[PDB]
Design a protein around this ligand. Structure first.
Ligand SMILES: CCCCCCCCCCCCO[C@@H]1O[C@H](CO)[C@@H](O[C@H]2O[C@H](CO)[C@@H](O)[C@H](O)[C@H]2O)[C@H](O)[C@H]1O
Ligand SMILES: CCCCCCCCCCCCO[C@@H]1O[C@H](CO)[C@@H](O[C@H]2O[C@H](CO)[C@@H](O)[C@H](O)[C@H]2O)[C@H](O)[C@H]1O
Ligand SMILES: CCCCCCCCCCCCO[C@@H]1O[C@H](CO)[C@@H](O[C@H]2O[C@H](CO)[C@@H](O)[C@H](O)[C@H]2O)[C@H](O)[C@H]1O
Ligand SMILES: CCCCCCCCCCCCO[C@@H]1O[C@H](CO)[C@@H](O[C@H]2O[C@H](CO)[C@@H](O)[C@H](O)[C@H]2O)[C@H](O)[C@H]1O
Ligand SMILES: CCCCCCCCCCCCO[C@@H]1O[C@H](CO)[C@@H](O[C@H]2O[C@H](CO)[C@@H](O)[C@H](O)[C@H]2O)[C@H](O)[C@H]1O
Ligand SMILES: CCCCCCCCCCCCO[C@@H]1O[C@H](CO)[C@@H](O[C@H]2O[C@H](CO)[C@@H](O)[C@H](O)[C@H]2O)[C@H](O)[C@H]1O
Ligand SMILES: CCCCCCCCCCCCO[C@@H]1O[C@H](CO)[C@@H](O[C@H]2O[C@H](CO)[C@@H](O)[C@H](O)[C@H]2O)[C@H](O)[C@H]1O
Ligand SMILES: CCCCCCCCCCCCO[C@@H]1O[C@H](CO)[C@@H](O[C@H]2O[C@H](CO)[C@@H](O)[C@H](O)[C@H]2O)[C@H](O)[C@H]1O
Ligand SMILES: CCCCCCCCCCCCO[C@@H]1O[C@H](CO)[C@@H](O[C@H]2O[C@H](CO)[C@@H](O)[C@H](O)[C@H]2O)[C@H](O)[C@H]1O
Ligand SMILES: CCCCCCCCCCCCO[C@@H]1O[C@H](CO)[C@@H](O[C@H]2O[C@H](CO)[C@@H](O)[C@H](O)[C@H]2O)[C@H](O)[C@H]1O
Ligand SMILES: CCCCCCCCCCCCO[C@@H]1O[C@H](CO)[C@@H](O[C@H]2O[C@H](CO)[C@@H](O)[C@H](O)[C@H]2O)[C@H](O)[C@H]1O
Ligand SMILES: CCCCCCCCCCCCO[C@@H]1O[C@H](CO)[C@@H](O[C@H]2O[C@H](CO)[C@@H](O)[C@H](O)[C@H]2O)[C@H](O)[C@H]1O
Ligand SMILES: CCCCCCCCCCCCO[C@@H]1O[C@H](CO)[C@@H](O[C@H]2O[C@H](CO)[C@@H](O)[C@H](O)[C@H]2O)[C@H](O)[C@H]1O
Ligand SMILES: CCCCCCCCCCCCO[C@@H]1O[C@H](CO)[C@@H](O[C@H]2O[C@H](CO)[C@@H](O)[C@H](O)[C@H]2O)[C@H](O)[C@H]1O
Ligand SMILES: CCCCCCCCCCCCO[C@@H]1O[C@H](CO)[C@@H](O[C@H]2O[C@H](CO)[C@@H](O)[C@H](O)[C@H]2O)[C@H](O)[C@H]1O
Ligand SMILES: Nc1ncnc2c1ncn2[C@@H]1O[C@H](COP(=O)(O)OP(=O)(O)O)[C@@H](O)[C@H]1O
Ligand SMILES: Nc1ncnc2c1ncn2[C@@H]1O[C@H](COP(=O)(O)OP(=O)(O)O)[C@@H](O)[C@H]1O
Ligand SMILES: Nc1ncnc2c1ncn2[C@@H]1O[C@H](COP(=O)(O)OP(=O)(O)O)[C@@H](O)[C@H]1O
Ligand SMILES: Nc1ncnc2c1ncn2[C@@H]1O[C@H](COP(=O)(O)OP(=O)(O)O)[C@@H](O)[C@H]1O
Ligand SMILES: [K+]
Ligand SMILES: [K+]
Ligand SMILES: [Mg+2]
Ligand SMILES: [Mg+2]
Ligand SMILES: [Mg+2]
Ligand SMILES: [Mg+2]
Lengths: 436, 132, 437, 132, 132, 132
């Protein structure tokens, strides 16, 4: 329909809409969590702030047990909070991408669908996916849990899985269903689809008849890297943890593969664990850290540096090692600003991660692998715990809250700053600096 | 009371400045974002849009506006097509700025209610100023 | 004088000269170390390959003790190797930098400085004078303690090692007996600071100091400012984190703590000597030193990791990006986007190789992540500081360290020249957007 | 069947869109990256290349394609150069768009198999269309 | 003393090299980044900017500098605009290079304080030098 | 036996190819790197250098060479200046290619031993081939 927009007046304001929107749901969500209606014992200001940040950023990290410490009304709020986190982040990303495309198209016309329809498709896709997951989970839990409690658990866990949240109502988050394929595959399909990105889902929905060859480059990158990432993670986790008695040694051959696939998928932002990461071999925690950093798709409910960013950096590296002039992906040149965006995102993420690990090591006393794993899980919004979150101190909790906030919104925000820098009237002469 | 100005060049920006200073609602529309930002401070509402696009003109309720000024000068086809689309949209009065006599003839035959030729009209005006 | 070159006859060949030069000296050095003339007991193939790679890359990692396992002839060979590895990289990197400027200069004239021999003479002259100044200061203390003939040898070995940013020591505990000795510590500290500063910085200051700091080249200004802050921040951070640790710095005097903190702050940037024990360092101090090792020394110096200027460009590119400025500016100069991409690519590629190397080390040998990560960075950054992993390194682990030491030594320089001259192409594919963030 | 279309103006993009709509794989080549991007949406493979360059054409492997259509309109020199290079690259059937009767005769001498004059041939076609 | 030199051609770079050799701090401004680079080697501060833009000149803070030298030679329009903007900025002394007598008269009317015609003034100098 | 060719254009590269076929040492030098690479496979030694640089000509010991050919056509000033520098370099025999009659006049007076005008010289021979 109508392609138009109102200019801001006076740099892009996408960074400002991204932060204000998060803090405008975090502070209200925090002030609500302190009320005793939602907690059996009540949450302190630090604990309530941590829980609000973990829910709104859908990190899933818990200073208190979700199933026990919250009341019936508190869990309903938690579904609302993580639903807002995941779905609203996906919707806001799609909306900002739509406005970016509109401004770009009008600029192109100057030199030489509907938003409401888009938002409707985002919500309806989420509701359909969550309803499918809810039906599949109810088919397994309702017989053993009742017609009321089993339905509630199915809805809660379907919402958590789609939103890539990882909140669980059990004391051990899905460790009792390591050998259950139905629930494991139900949850796995929920955050793979929830974390795929609505751009990919829409491109496949509208242009699957044309074939894979005519899908957008981002869609092809996701549809190839996501199966590759899942398969690599599954094979690596199975190889590195098949002989470990404490996590996967006791399971059957099918159980071991199911657990390995579940961790390979849950690492990419969901945060559920069918095994204990506290008892994982270090070669496997490094693999899972790498998987957590990559994260889910760009315009999805998940987090991480995003699969597309890792793909452009991996392909740029191959281009540089082969001394090729252009970064080519699926017979398309990746423009140098995109490569610079991906590399800058990785470098800035590494800098903030190093600062956060150093601060945690100052405030809390723990080994480096545990602190690094927790920092990566909080920054990437996976929320997998390695036994360090349970002993977080007050400054540690504040650092974790800040890291979860910056992790959730940092990549998209930094991407949009690189897109629209402030124009300048003064340029200094270019001079060369030696590198390497 | 309520006016629309399409095209925010030197002529259209002057129209917007005078109209808003007089105390009226002015929707300033230009495909170029810089000119829309320049006119944003003055007009009530400034929108970046392509008025050659029919669906955009449908979305912008130009039929509700008392008068619509089309101030596109460089591309004659853009002005002619914008005039046609505005007339199809139901705009009762369409004022079009034309730089050439052939463009003025075409716009008159299309149905523009007022054709403005700034150089000729100011020629007459400043001649009358010189006489008295 | 004459500005000309013979074209190879269109991708750059600087990457191939860099690798062939290292391997052209690695293999001859490896075979010599196996002969019993240089070792009291003789080195196996892997041990000699490790020792030669450590000496040629001037990493300084030792599977065997340098002072005891090697003979008098073996130590003389070791000085030759680390002089070839350190001064040789500075000589070669400056030589390749000169030819890059020659090709760039003639390219500008087609569209619209001293000779190589004088440059090489100044580089070797600057090295020998720098070592000679460090030689007499080290001789001033060890000759009374250890005699004339032995005293000059230890002064020469350590002055050469310090300048070349090698870290090889003839003592069982490398400079842990001289933590409270300012003359030994400061003489060594000055040697690898200037040895690691870079000849372009030394040359620019030498020829244009009268003009002032304002008219120095932008690279010189970065190295002249970032190095003191890297030294100062490292000195303060190490002192703050280890002032209360009895095992490393709690038993020293107030001056001794600052002297130790400054020494490790300086030695981390590629030298590899240690006044204290990193095996008994607080984890927050290992993380600080890992960052310091990764940054490394200057661009055209005897040692380095990713290099200070690479970190500085990425540091201020990040600051530019977070403020949404269109250009990266340093000292009223714009850093062009290809330079920014080079700096970011080096860090990302280095992390890719580092992560692969740490993962392999945990499989071949069993150790904690902090021990493996610290050793992998030191081998890659060429610092050679050990946290106990090298002592118990397994046979496959030695192969990984040799590869990491080779790639870490030449990787940042080689990757920079790959980015400088990519192969020209006749087929370009349409540009398409990929969503990131 | 595989077709190669060189030049992506009004004629070249119309041939590609018609050829690809029928299930044939088309290779679209142009020096203007904007038109290569525009064609890349629906064309099996699109490449930014200079087809007057004889080494570039060897990389495109135009000898493999059954028919090569050269639709360079404004640059006549590029049109004859591309036809010559395509013929020297061993292309069985070369179709060339010519804007003049003099260019068509030169292309006949070069070795073009089918030569299309868009203005003259479409004129004949519309003249037949009005009659019947 | 602070000097600002706008335009870094033969005259502008000669004035800057002399001013900086004499121990004065000069600002070199030019739209051609290529020429700004040679100046940056020996000039206290060099900036790539367009000096016909009012906001850009306000950013340069030319009113701080004692004298502003405008050495735009080929583009007489740019020279006139730069002199006008510098005077409107509030710079006390403006020296402008003019390659024509008519341009010199226009610059006198604008408000330039010292106008240098390099060809004619150099001719007078050379004649005096040959005489003595 | 031993020759030098400065400037590797169409004319200069033709000299290098024929000189090599007769088994003679040829030093091909050109400012542009691409043109030197083309002659790299046709000469004993191909060097990228600026022969307008006096010190560069000193390093390339052109006085040892029996004949030096300057084949710079587009920039008249470079060919005149390179011819002079070769004369102070001690080159006994200097052959210069000139594209214009005015350039050929200057080259004669500055001391070029042989001035080659390819259009005029080829004009005379082609007439002779036509006659017989
Ligand atoms: C989930 C995986 C996360 C890792 C992948 C990438 C992470 C990248 C982190 C980039 C750095 C954090 O990004 C940080 O965002 C804040 C806003 O929250 C920015 O601050 C910004 O706030 C407002 C509102 O957003 C912006 O309009 C404005 O441009 C700026 O003030 C900081 O300038 C930036 O440093
Ligand atoms: C669009 C939304 C659709 C939602 C779809 C949900 C599908 C869920 C399918 C569940 C299948 C039927 O699940 C059924 O659950 C009931 C209620 O607990 C179980 O319960 C059954 O045994 C228990 C004994 O403990 C009795 O008390 C109960 O009255 C009886 O129904 C049954 O064993 C099981 O057959
Ligand atoms: C909306 C996104 C999420 C949707 C995800 C995809 C649909 C949900 C997962 C479907 C696949 C899992 O489906 C599962 O398959 C396994 C086969 O291993 C079988 O699972 C079976 O396990 C054992 C036998 O092995 C039985 O005791 C159990 O009762 C039964 O469920 C069933 O067929 C189904 O439980
Ligand atoms: C969430 C996980 C999803 C898993 C599935 C996603 C991955 C799907 C992989 C399918 C791969 C198909 O592989 C790709 O097929 C296309 C057809 O579209 C082939 O394309 C081929 O036919 C098309 C016509 O359609 C031609 O235009 C093209 O020139 C030719 O190469 C590609 O050469 C091949 O690379
Ligand atoms: C270019 C990049 C190449 C990437 C290469 C990837 C190679 C993948 C090989 C995976 C190897 C799996 O090898 C597996 O290692 C683990 C962990 O060390 C060993 O595990 C062993 O040590 C661990 C301690 O870490 C104990 O907890 C465990 O009980 C014991 O079995 C397994 O016995 C071995 O089977
Ligand atoms: C390309 C991306 C990566 C693709 C990843 C593919 C992962 C495939 C995982 C296969 C999982 C193993 O498959 C699953 O094995 C389990 C465990 O035995 C079987 O489980 C069944 O038998 C076991 C006995 O071992 C019982 O304890 C269990 O209650 C019952 O459900 C399931 O019926 C089967 O579905
Ligand atoms: C735990 C670690 C896991 C590491 C996993 C690494 C995965 C990295 C992302 C891979 C995603 C898919 O990546 C994509 O693969 C397709 C496969 O045809 C490539 O496809 C392309 O290959 C080359 C690229 O010059 C060309 O033949 C052509 O352009 C196209 O076929 C893309 O260039 C690449 O970007
Ligand atoms: C490890 C724990 C977390 C620590 C890491 C935090 C990462 C996120 C960094 C947020 C950075 C915000 O800082 C970002 O840059 C500067 C500094 O305020 C602001 O910049 C603004 O104010 C400064 C003040 O001097 C002006 O000079 C500048 O011109 C203006 O743009 C940006 O508007 C803000 O967005
Ligand atoms: C061109 C480079 C020149 C390098 C110059 C370096 C000069 C360094 C001089 C250091 C000071 C002189 O150091 C001097 O060492 C000698 C030799 O051990 C000592 O003299 C020694 O002689 C013998 C050695 O067994 C013993 O009697 C006794 O141990 C001691 O007297 C002196 O007590 C000390 O004064
Ligand atoms: C070539 C590059 C390397 C050159 C480095 C710079 C020159 C070498 C270091 C010079 C500075 C160290 O110089 C050192 O200063 C300290 C002061 O703390 C003093 O050191 C002193 O320490 C104690 C007293 O405190 C005495 O027992 C000792 O004998 C004496 O050396 C001396 O003056 C000198 O030993
Ligand atoms: C290895 C460690 C070495 C440590 C020493 C290296 C760091 C030295 C820091 C010196 C800093 C001088 O600081 C810098 O001085 C210069 C003079 O050159 C000042 O420059 C000033 O005077 C110069 C004239 O010389 C003017 O051209 C310039 O416009 C003006 O700003 C800078 O404004 C100031 O930033
Ligand atoms: C934006 C980035 C900001 C960067 C902020 C940098 C802040 C620097 C503060 C340094 C703090 C030093 O604080 C110091 O920490 C160490 C290590 O934990 C404490 O050390 C304590 O725990 C360690 C274990 O790690 C014991 O070995 C030691 O014996 C004991 O004292 C010190 O008692 C305390 O003095
Ligand atoms: C800007 C970059 C960073 C700059 C870094 C500056 C670091 C400064 C380090 C100062 C070191 C302390 O200074 C040094 O203290 C030691 C230890 O007491 C003194 O040492 C002296 O006294 C001590 C007693 O404590 C004796 O044991 C010792 O034998 C003797 O040499 C030195 O005479 C003095 O030189
Ligand atoms: C000391 C700190 C180190 C960390 C800082 C930066 C490290 C960056 C590492 C870049 C990757 C390693 O760089 C690796 O170099 C080898 C050569 O040795 C390259 O391989 C190259 O070898 C030859 C000879 O060098 C080159 O002419 C040719 O272009 C290519 O074949 C690899 O393509 C590249 O991957
Ligand atoms: C272990 C971690 C240690 C942290 C150490 C970080 C060291 C970083 C080295 C930075 C090197 C200096 O880097 C250079 O600094 C100068 C100071 O003159 C900055 O100079 C500029 O800063 C900003 C840029 O908007 C403005 O105030 C102004 O234009 C100018 O002062 C440059 O933008 C930067 O390129
Ligand atoms: N299709 C269009 N829709 C809306 N505005 C347009 C369209 N085409 C042109 N314009 C605007 O009309 C304005 C008038 O242009 P013009 O008369 O050339 O003024 P100027 O000469 O100052 O550019 C232009 O600034 C342009 O941005
Ligand atoms: N040497 C060349 N190689 C490939 N494509 C070319 C070459 N020269 C011109 N073209 C392309 O041929 C197309 C047709 O040219 P032209 O007739 O000018 O455009 P149009 O048909 O839209 O008027 C142009 O878009 C141009 O990019
Ligand atoms: N608007 C402008 N602002 C700043 N510098 C300008 C502007 N317009 C032109 N210049 C520069 O002023 C100088 C005028 O010198 P010019 O006569 O063009 O060259 P030269 O003197 O070298 O023959 C040039 O460097 C030109 O690029
Ligand atoms: N100063 C110079 N030193 C060396 N070679 C030069 C110099 N100036 C020009 N040349 C070369 O001389 C050759 C003569 O080419 P010319 O006929 O002038 O131009 P074109 O290559 O456009 O036909 C070119 O290859 C050019 O690069
Ligand atoms: K999560
Ligand atoms: K070292
Ligand atoms: Mg206008
Ligand atoms: Mg056409
Ligand atoms: Mg001039
Ligand atoms: Mg030529």
């Amino acid at each position: 329909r109508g392609v138009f927009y109102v200019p801001d007046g006076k740099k892009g304001g996408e960074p400002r809409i991204i932060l204000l929107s998060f803090l405008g749901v975090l502070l209200p969500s925090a002030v609500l969590l302190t009320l005793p209606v939602f907690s059996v014992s009540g949450l302190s200001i630090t604990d309530a702030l941590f829980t609000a940040t973990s829910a709104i950023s859908v990190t899933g990290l818990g200073v208190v047990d979700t199933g026990q410490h919250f009341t019936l009304a508190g869990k309903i709020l938690l579904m609302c909070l993580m639903q807002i986190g995941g779905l609203g982040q996906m919707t806001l990303s799609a909306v900002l991408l739509y406005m970016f495309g509109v401004r770009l198209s009008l600029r192109q016309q100057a030199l030489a669908v509907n938003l409401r329809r888009l938002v409707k498709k985002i919500v309806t896709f989420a509701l359909v996916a969550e309803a499918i997951g809810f039906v599949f989970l109810s088919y397994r839990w309702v017989p053993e849990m009742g017609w009321q409690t089993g339905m509630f658990y199915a809805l809660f866990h379907s919402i958590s899985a789609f939103n890539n949240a990882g909140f669980a109502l059990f004391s051990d988050s899905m460790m009792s269903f390591v050998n259950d394929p139905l629930v494991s595959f139900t949850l796995a399909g929920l955050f793979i689809f929830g974390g795929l990105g609505f751009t990919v889902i829409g491109d496949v929905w509208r242009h699957w008849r044309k074939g894979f060859h005519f899908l957008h480059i981002h869609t092809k990158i996701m549809l190839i890297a996501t199966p590759l990432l899942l398969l690599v993670g599954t094979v690596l986790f199975w190889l590195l943890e098949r002989h470990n008695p404490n996590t996967m040694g006791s399971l059957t051959t099918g159980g071991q593969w199911l657990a390995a696939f579940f961790q390979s998928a849950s690492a990419r932002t969901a945060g559920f664990n069918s095994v204990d990461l506290t008892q994982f071999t270090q070669p496997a925690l490094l693999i899972m850290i790498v998987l957590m950093l990559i994260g889910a798709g760009s315009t999805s409910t998940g987090g991480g540096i995003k699969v597309s960013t890792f793909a452009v950096a991996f392909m740029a590296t191959w281009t540089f090692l082969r001394q090729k002039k252009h970064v080519v992906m699926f017979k398309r040149t990746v423009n140098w600003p995109t490569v610079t965006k991906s590399l800058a995102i990785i470098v800035v993420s590494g800098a903030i991660l190093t600062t956060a690990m150093f601060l945690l090591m100052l405030t809390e006393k723990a080994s480096f692998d545990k602190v690094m794993f927790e920092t990566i899980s909080a920054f990437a919004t996976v929320g997998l715990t390695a036994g360090l979150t349970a002993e977080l101190s007050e400054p540690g909790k504040y650092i974790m809250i800040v890291v979860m906030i910056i992790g959730r919104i940092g990549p998209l925000t930094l991407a949009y700053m690189l897109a629209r820098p402030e124009p300048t009237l003064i340029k200094y002469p270019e001079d060369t600096v030696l590198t390497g | 009371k309520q006016f629309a100005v399409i095209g925010l060049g030197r002529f259209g920006l002057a129209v917007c400045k005078e109209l808003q200073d007089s105390g009226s609602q002015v929707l300033a529309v230009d495909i170029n974002e810089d000119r829309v930002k320049e006119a944003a401070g003055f007009v009530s509402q400034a929108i970046v849009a392509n008025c050659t696009h029919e669906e955009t003109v449908a979305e912008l309720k130009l039929d509700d506006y008392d008068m619509v000024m089309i101030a596109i000068g460089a591309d004659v086809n853009a002005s002619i097509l914008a005039t046609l689309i505005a007339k199809e949209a139901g705009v009762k009065s369409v004022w079009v700025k034309a730089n050439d006599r052939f463009q003025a003839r075409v716009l008159q035959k299309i149905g523009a209610d007022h054709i403005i030729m700034p150089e000729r009209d100011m020629g007459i005006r400043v001649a009358r100023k010189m006489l008295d």
